[PDB]
Amino acid sequence: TTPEEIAQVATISANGDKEIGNIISDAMKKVGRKGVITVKDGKTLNDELEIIEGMKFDRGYISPYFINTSKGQKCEFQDAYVLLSEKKISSIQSIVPALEIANAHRKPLVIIAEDVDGEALSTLVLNRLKVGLQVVA
Amino acid sequence: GQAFRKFLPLFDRVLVERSAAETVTKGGIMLPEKSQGKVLQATVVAVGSGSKGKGGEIQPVSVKVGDKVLLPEYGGTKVVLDDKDYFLFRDGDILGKYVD
Numbered sequence: 001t002t003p004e005e006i007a008q009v010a011t012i013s014a015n016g017d018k019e020i021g022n023i024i025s026d027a028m029k030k031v032g033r034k035g036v037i038t039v040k041d042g043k044t045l046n047d048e049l050e051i052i053e054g055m056k057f058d059r060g061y062i063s064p065y066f067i068n069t070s071k072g073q074k075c076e077f078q079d080a081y082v083l084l085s086e087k088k089i090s091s092i093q094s095i096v097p098a099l100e101i102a103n104a105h106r107k108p109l110v111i112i113a114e115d116v117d118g119e120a121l122s123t124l125v126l127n128r129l130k131v132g133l134q135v136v137a
Numbered sequence: 138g139q140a141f142r143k144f145l146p147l148f149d150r151v152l153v154e155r156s157a158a159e160t161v162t163k164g165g166i167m168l169p170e171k172s173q174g175k176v177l178q179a180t181v182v183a184v185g186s187g188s189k190g191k192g193g194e195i196q197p198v199s200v201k202v203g204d205k206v207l208l209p210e211y212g213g214t215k216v217v218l219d220d221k222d223y224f225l226f227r228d229g230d231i232l233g234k235y236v237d
Contacts, residue, residue: 092172100164122169130167 003029023049062116065125066136075136077108085113095120099127099135108134139202141183142218149198149228152183152216153206178235179208182223198228205235 003025011021027037030051042048066075083098089111102109116124116137127133138145146152158173181204187197200206209232213224 092168096162096166099166100162103165119169119172122172123166126169127167131165133166 006033019047023047027051062137063121063125065128068134077110077134077136080108080110080134081105083109083111085111088114088117089120090117092119092123095123099123099133102135103133109136111135111137113137138186139184141202141223144183144216144218146183146185146225148185149188149196150185150225151181151198151200151228151231152223152225153179153181153208154221154223155179155208175210177208177210178205179224180205185228188228200228200231200234205237207232207235 006028007018007021007025009021010024011018014020024037027049028035030049031037061075067073069076081098081102089095095111095116098109098111101107111124121137124135124137128135141152144152155176156178158170158176159168160170160173161167181200181202184198184200184202187195190196208224208226209230212230213226216223216225
């Protein structure tokens with residue numbers, strides 16, 4: 001009934017390690033008791049807990065020219081439009097109208113798709129570098 | 138027949154200049170240069186004397202110099218005039234003209 005018992009169970013099960021019990025009780029307090037907790041290798045001397053909120057997936061950008069944050073080499077926007085595609089985007093006419101909605105409302109656009117092929121990629125990078133339209137694939 | 142910058146086409150061949158390729162859309166999105174494609178709208182800049190369908194009579198070309206026409210996708214001959222690109226088509230190959 002209490003997270004103190006959760007910490008006690010995780011401490012007893014980890015050969016009396018109180019720090020492991022605390023770092024598991026904190027994880028269960030943050031992501032929920034019936035939540036996803038994954039043990040991973042660490043490159044430091046001490047353990048750490050990383051809470052991933054929202055929708056994070058292990059896919060990078062198609063083109064490195066979409067970077068607008070120089071400090072972390074990241075691509076960051078606020079209040080961005082999202083265009084999702086089941087199939088691969090290759091043609092000019094399949095990506096231009098979404099760019100018209102992005103440009104008319106002056107909102108950033110992130111296009112999550114299977115892949116972005118040469119014509120659409122050329123359009124996106126050329127619009128990003130020439131006029132200043134904010135867009136990432 | 139009429140000549141454009143000292144070039145008179147022979148028989149029913151006409152010489153046209155393709156229109157400028159579309160670089161930007163209406164809402165401001167610009168297009169890559171490669172994906173612009175071949176422009177199918179052109180302006181006739183030179184006309185020939187016309188092919189002789191029957192002996193003793195010369196049939197002139199339908200189009201005239203200064204007419205906006207719609208070219209076919211295939212059939213043109215490349216002509217380099219004053220370091221500029223022009224295309225020689227037959228009189229019958231032109232799909233139609235824009236009347237205004």
